[PDB]
Ligand binder design. Structure first.
Ligand SMILES: *[C@@H]1O[C@H](CO)[C@@H](O[C@@H]2O[C@H](CO)[C@@H](O[C@@H]3O[C@H](CO[C@H]4O[C@H](CO)[C@@H](O)[C@H](O)[C@@H]4O)[C@@H](O)[C@H](O[C@H]4O[C@H](CO)[C@@H](O)[C@H](O)[C@@H]4O)[C@@H]3O)[C@H](O)[C@H]2NC(C)=O)[C@H](O)[C@H]1NC(C)=O
Ligand SMILES: *[C@@H]1O[C@H](CO)[C@@H](O[C@@H]2O[C@H](CO)[C@@H](O[C@@H]3O[C@H](CO[C@H]4O[C@H](CO)[C@@H](O)[C@H](O)[C@@H]4O)[C@@H](O)[C@H](O[C@H]4O[C@H](CO)[C@@H](O)[C@H](O)[C@@H]4O)[C@@H]3O)[C@H](O)[C@H]2NC(C)=O)[C@H](O)[C@H]1NC(C)=O
Ligand SMILES: *[C@@H]1O[C@H](CO)[C@@H](O[C@@H]2O[C@H](CO)[C@@H](O[C@@H]3O[C@H](CO)[C@@H](O)[C@H](O)[C@@H]3O)[C@H](O)[C@H]2NC(C)=O)[C@H](O)[C@H]1NC(C)=O
Ligand SMILES: *[C@@H]1O[C@H](CO)[C@@H](O)[C@H](O)[C@H]1NC(C)=O
Ligand SMILES: *[C@@H]1O[C@H](CO)[C@@H](O)[C@H](O)[C@H]1NC(C)=O
Ligand SMILES: *[C@@H]1O[C@H](CO)[C@@H](O)[C@H](O)[C@H]1NC(C)=O
Ligand SMILES: *[C@@H]1O[C@H](CO)[C@@H](O)[C@H](O)[C@H]1NC(C)=O
Ligand SMILES: *[C@@H]1O[C@H](CO)[C@@H](O)[C@H](O)[C@H]1NC(C)=O
Ligand SMILES: *[C@@H]1O[C@H](CO)[C@@H](O)[C@H](O)[C@H]1NC(C)=O
Length: 738
C-alpha cells in the first residue's frame, strides 16, 4: 500500500499529496480518493479534462503551477469538484480565464498567464471568492480589458491583485468588502477621488511602480514622460479610514500632500522608496498626520549629482510617536552628527534604524547613546574609516542583522565599510553592544586584547571576510562574555613561519559556545592543541586537515564539551586511526562530508557513545561494515550519499537506533535477501535510494517485497529510483515492475 507517484502525508486528519517536480506527462489516476490537497506543480502536464480528478471528490486544494515546465483546460473540467476551495493556476500560458470554474472557489491564482480579458463568463459566477490573484498577465496586448462591473458580484472579495498589468486606470465598480487592493506597476498615472469610492473596509493599498524611478529593477522599468510623478487627487484617500498599509514606492513623487492622511488615523506601514522626497524629509507637513505609523521607509530618495555633508531630518519627525523602524537607505550623505538625529531620540518605540548604502564617511557614534529603545543599528555599505511574483520588490523584508546575533541584545552592523584596521577610538562612545558585525572590511588588525575594550559585552562577533591576525593568545579575550565567534574566509595577512596559526586564545573564553574557523586555510598550527570547557560547536571546513595529519593527532582532544564538529572540505584522503580516536567523545554530530575518503574505520565509532549523526556524503567510500551494531548503539542518522558503495552488507539494517539511512547517488545494483534478513524488528523511518544504477531484473524482486512489507520505512523520490538495466525497464522506477 505504498503511494506512487505522490508522497502522501496525513496533516491534521487531511491527507496531502506532494506530486510536484516528478516529470509527470498527465494527471495520475493512482492518487488516493481520500486526499484533500494535491500539488501537481512543475510537471509536464498539458491537458486538464473532467476525468483528471475523477473519484477525488474531497479535493479542497489543487496546485497546477508551471505546467508544462501551454496548459489546455476544457470547459467545466473542475466543475465536478464540489469541495474545491483553492485553485492555483500560475505560469500555465492560459490565453483566457478557464470557463466552468466551480462556485465553491475561495482562492484563485492566475499569475503569469496570457489572460488579456477579465470577463463575467469566468469571474462573475464565482461569488464565494475571497482572494483573486491576476498579476503578470498583460505586462509587456496594449491594455487589459476589464469588463465594466466584473468584480461587482464578488461581494466576499477581500484581496484583489491586478499588479504588473497594462491597466492605465483603476477598474471601477469594486466590491465594498475589499480589504487589500494591489495595483503595483499598472501604468496608472492619475488617481482621482472617485477611483476608490466605496472601499470603507480597505486596510491595504499598493500603488507602487506607477511613474517609476528606475533603480536596478528586476522587471522592466519605463519612467513617465517629462519626469512626471503619480498624480493623486487631494481627496483621493478621504474615504479610506481603515487604511493601515500604503505602498507608494517608485512613484517619482516630489511633494507629499498631507491632506491624503487626514482621514487615515490607523496608517501603520508607509512605503516611500525610490522617490525624490529629500525636500519632504527636510520639511514634510505629512509627518504630523501619522501618529500611529510603526514602519516608515524613505530609502533611495537621493538627489542626482549631490553628496550633501549632512542628512536634513525635519523636526516634525518627533511627531511619529508610534515609530518602530525607520528605513533611510540610499539618501547618500557624508556625515551624521548628533544634532541631525535630534527629532528621533525621544520616540519611545523606535528600535530599528536602517542607514545602509549611504556612503557616510564619518559618524558621531555618541548619538546612539541618546536613543531610548534602539536595538538594531544597521550601517552596512558605508564609508566609515579607522578611529518571484509573490515578493516585496521595493522594501527590504529580510532581517537586517541575523536573528541569532540580534537575540543577544543591541546589534550594530558595520560591515562593507572602509575599516581596514580597528583604530584605538573605533568603538568609543558606543552603547552596550551585544551583537557586532565587522564583515568584509579588508581588516588586517593584529588582535591583542584591547580593540574591543569600549564594548566588552559583545556576545556574537562576526569578523568574516577579513585579513585578521589572531595569533596572539590575548586576541579577543577582552570580550569575556563572547559566545559566538565567526571567522569564516579569514585570509591571514601577516603569516609568521613558526607562529601562524596560533589558536591559544580560544581556551581563555569561559562561555564561548560556537566558533567558525571555516575557509581559513589552516595548514599549520603552533601549544598545537585546541582546548575549551564551554565550546559546543566547531566549524573547521575549508581548511587543510590533510596536511596537518604526528604533532596534530590530538588537535581537538581538549574540546571536552564539543557536540558538533564540521570537518568538511579538508581534502582528507585517509583519517589516521590514532587521530580519529582522539576526537571528542561527547560528539553528537560529526560531519566529514565533501572530502576524498577512500576508507572509513567503523570500529572506531565504539569510543563515541553519544554520536547520533554521522555525515560521510561526497566521499569515495566503497565498503560498509557487516557488524555496525557491535560498534554503535546511538547512531540515529547516517548520511552516505554520493559515494562508491556497490554492496549493502549482510544484516546492515539488523543497528536498532538507526532512523535515517541515506544511500542515494551510490553504485548499488541490487539489495539481496541477506541484507534484508532481519530477525529483530528495525526502527528505520527513512531510506533514501535515488540515483543508484539498479538492475531491474528478477534480483530486484526480493527488495520490492521488502518495500511492501515495511510501509513504515518511508522511501522518498520514488520517481528518481531509476533502473539502469535492462533496456526495456531503463528509465522506469523500481516500484513499476513485474
Ligand atoms: C507594497 O507594500 C505592501 C505592504 O507591505 C506589500 O504587501 C505585501 O506583499 C507580500 C507579497 O505579496 C505579502 O507576502 C505574503 O504574505 C502571505 C500572507 O502572510 C501573512 O499571513 C500568514 C498567515 O496566513 C502569516 O503567517 C504571515 O506572517 C503574514 O502575516 C504569505 O503567505 C506569503 O508567503 C509565501 O511567499 C513568501 C515569498 O515568496 C515565502 O517566503 C513564504 O514561504 C510563502 O511561500 C507572503 O509572505 C505580504 O503579506 C503583503 N503585506 C500585507 C500586509 O498584505 C507589497 O508587496 C508591496 N509591493 C511591492 C511591489 O513591493
Ligand atoms: C559559521 O558557523 C556557524 C555555526 O555553524 C554558522 O551559524 C549557524 O548557521 C546555521 C545554518 O547554516 C543556523 O541554523 C539554522 O537556524 C535557523 C534558525 O533557528 C531557529 O529556529 C529553529 C526552529 O526553526 C530552532 O530550533 C532554533 O533553536 C532557532 O530558534 C533554522 O531555521 C535553520 O533550519 C533549517 O535548516 C536545518 C538544517 O540546517 C533544517 O533541518 C531545518 O528544517 C531548516 O530547513 C537552521 O537550523 C545556526 O542557527 C547558526 N548558528 C549561529 C550560532 O548563528 C554560520 O552561518 C557560519 N558562517 C558562515 C559564513 O558560513
Ligand atoms: C554581516 O554582514 C554581512 C555583509 O553585509 C552579511 O552577509 C550577507 O548576508 C546576506 C544574508 O545571508 C546575504 O544576502 C543574500 O545573498 C544571496 C546571494 O547573493 C541572495 O540570493 C539572497 O537573496 C540574499 O540577498 C549577503 O549576500 C551577504 N553579504 C556578503 C557580502 O556575503 C552577514 O550576514 C552579516 N552577519 C550577521 C551576523 O548578521
Ligand atoms: C470524503 O471524506 C469523508 C470524511 O470527511 C468520507 O466519509 C468520504 O467517504 C470521502 N469521500 C471520498 C470520495 O473520498
Ligand atoms: C509601543 O509598543 C507597545 C507594544 O510593544 C505598545 O503597547 C505601546 O503603546 C507602543 N507605544 C507607543 C507610544 O506607540
Ligand atoms: C543627549 O543629546 C543631547 C543633545 O541632543 C545632549 O545634551 C545630552 O547630553 C545627550 N545625553 C547623552 C546621555 O548622550
Ligand atoms: C600580545 O598581546 C599582549 C596583551 O595585549 C601584548 O602585551 C603583547 O605585546 C602582544 N604580543 C605581540 C607580539 O604584540
Ligand atoms: C558544556 O557546555 C554548555 C554550553 O556551553 C555549558 O552550559 C556546560 O556547563 C558545559 N559543561 C561542562 C561540563 O563543561
Ligand atoms: C581500525 O583501527 C584499529 C586501530 O585503532 C586497527 O587495529 C584496525 O585494523 C582498523 N580497521 C580497519 C578496517 O582499518
Amino acid at each position: 500500500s505504498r503511494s506512487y507517484p505522490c508522497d502522501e502525508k496525513k496533516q491534521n486528519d487531511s491527507v496531502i499529496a506532494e506530486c510536484s517536480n516528478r516529470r509527470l506527462q498527465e494527471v495520475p489516476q493512482t492518487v488516493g480518493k481520500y486526499v484533500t490537497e494535491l500539488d501537481l506543480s512543475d510537471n509536464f502536464i498539458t491537458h486538464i479534462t473532467n476525468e483528471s480528478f475523477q473519484g477525488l471528490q474531497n479535493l479542497t486544494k489543487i496546485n497546477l503551477n508551471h505546467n508544462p515546465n501551454g496548459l489546455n483546460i476544457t470547459d467545466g473540467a473542475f466543475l465536478n469538484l464540489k469541495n474545491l476551495r483553492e485553485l492555483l493556476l500560475e505560469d500555465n500560458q492560459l490565453p483566457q480565464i478557464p470557463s466552468g470554474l466551480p462556485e465553491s472557489l475561495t482562492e484563485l491564482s492566475l499569475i503569469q498567464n496570457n489572460i488579456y480579458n477579465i470577463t463575467k463568463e469566468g469571474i462573475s459566477r464565482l461569488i464565494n471568492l475571497k482572494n483573486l490573484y491576476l498579476a503578470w498577465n498583460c505586462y509587456f496586448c496594449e491594455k487589459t480589458n476589464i469588463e465594466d462591473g466584473v468584480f461587482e458580484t464578488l461581494t466576499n472579495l477581500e484581496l484583489l491583485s491586478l499588479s504588473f498589468n497594462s491597466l492605465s486606470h483603476v477598474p471601477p465598480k469594486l466590491p465594498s468588502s475589499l480589504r487589500k487592493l494591489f495595483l503595483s506597476n499598472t501604468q496608472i498615472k492619475y488617481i482621482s477621488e472617485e477611483d476608490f469610492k466605496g472601499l470603507i473596509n480597505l486596510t491595504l493599498l499598493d500603488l507602487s511602480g506607477n511613474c517609476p524611478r528606475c533603480f536596478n529593477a528586476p522587471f522592466p522599468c519605463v519612467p513617465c514622460d517629462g519626469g512626471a510623478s503619480i498624480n493623486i487627487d487631494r481627496f483621493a484617500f478621504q474615504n479610506l479610514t481603515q487604511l493601515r498599509y500604503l505602498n507608494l514606492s517608485s512613484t517619482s513623487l516630489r511633494k507629499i500632500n498631507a491632506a491624503w492622511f487626514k482621514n487615515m488615523p490607523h496608517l501603520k506601514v508607509l512605503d516611500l522608496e525610490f522617490n525624490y522626497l529629500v525636500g519632504e524629509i527636510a520639511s514634510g507637513a505629512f509627518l504630523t498626520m501619522l501618529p500611529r505609523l510603526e514602519i516608515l521607509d524613505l530609502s533611495f530618495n537621493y538627489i542626482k549629482g549631490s553628496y550633501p555633508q549632512h542628512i536634513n531630518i525635519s523636526r516634525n519627525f518627533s511627531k511619529l510617536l508610534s515609530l518602530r523602524a525607520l528605513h533611510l537607505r540610499g539618501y547618500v550623505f557624508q556625515e551624521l552628527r548628533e544634532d541631525d538625529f535630534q527629532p528621533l531620540m525621544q520616540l519611545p518605540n523606535l528600535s530599528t534604524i536602517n542607514l545602509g548604502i549611504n556612503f557616510i564617511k564619518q559618524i558621531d557614534f555618541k548619538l546612539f547613546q541618546n536613543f531610548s529603545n534602539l536595538e538594531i543599528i544597521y550601517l552596512s555599505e558605508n564609508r566609515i574609516s579607522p578611529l518571484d511574483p509573490h515578493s516585496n520588490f521595493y522594501h527590504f523584508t529580510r532581517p537586517l542583522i541575523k536573528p541569532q546575533c540580534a537575540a543577544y541584545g543591541k546589534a550594530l552592523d558595520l560591515s562593507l565599510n572602509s575599516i581596514f584596521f580597528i583604530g584605538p577610538n573605533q568603538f568609543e562612545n558606543l552603547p552596550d553592544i551585544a551583537c557586532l558585525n565587522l564583515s568584509a572590511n579588508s581588516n588586517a588588525q593584529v588582535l591583542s586584547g584591547t580593540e574591543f575594550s569600549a564594548i566588552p559585552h559583545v556576545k556574537y562577533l562576526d569578523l568574516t571576510n577579513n585579513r585578521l591576525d589572531f595569533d596572539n593568545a590575548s586576541a579577543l579575550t577582552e570580550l569575556s562574555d563572547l559566545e559566538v565567534l565567526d571567522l569564516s574566509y579569514n585570509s591571514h595577512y601577516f603569516r609568521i613561519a613558526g607562529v601562524t596559526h596560533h589558536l591559544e586564545f580560544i581556551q581563555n573564553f569561559t562561555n564561548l559556545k560556537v566558533l567558525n574557523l571555516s575557509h581559513n586555510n589552516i595548514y599549520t598550527l603552533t601549544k598545537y592543541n585546541l582546548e575549551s570547557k564551554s565550546l559546543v560547536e566547531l566549524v573547521f571546513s575549508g581548511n587543510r586537515l590533510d596536511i596537518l595529519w604526528n604533532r596534530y593527532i590530538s588537535i581537538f582532544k581538549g574540546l571536552k564539551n564539543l557536540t558538533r564538529l564540521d570537518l568538511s572540505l579538508n581534502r582528507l584522503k585517509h583519517i589516521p586511526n590514532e587521530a580519529f580516536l582522539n576526537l571528542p567523545a561527547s560528539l553528537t554530530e560529526l560531519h566529514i562530508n565533501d572530502n576524498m575518503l577512500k576508507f572509513f574505520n567503523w570500529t572506531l565509532l565504539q569510543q563515541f557513545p553519544r554520536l547520533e549523526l554521522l555525515d560521510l556524503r561526497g566521499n569515495k567510500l566503497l565498503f560498509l561494515t557487516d557488524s555496525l551494531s557491535d560498534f554503535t548503539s546511538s547512531l540515529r542518522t547516517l548520511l552516505l550519499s554520493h559515494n562508491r558503495i556497490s554492496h549493502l552488507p549482510s544484516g546492515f539494517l539488523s543497528v536498532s537506533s538507526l532512523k535515517h539511512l541515506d544511500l542515494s547517488s551510490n553504485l548499488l545494483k541490487t539489495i539481496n535477501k541477506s541484507a534484508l534478513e532481519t530477525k529483530t524488528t528495525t526502527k528505520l523511518s527513512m531510506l533514501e535510494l535515488h540515483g543508484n544504477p539498479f538492475e531491474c531484473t528478477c534480483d530486484i524482486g526480493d527488495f520490492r517485497r521488502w518495500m511492501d512489507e515495511h510501509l513504515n520505512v518511508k522511501i522518498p523520490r520514488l520517481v528518481d529510483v531509476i533502473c539502469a538495466s535492462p533496456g526495456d525497464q531503463r528509465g522506469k522506477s523500481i516500484v513499476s515492475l513485474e
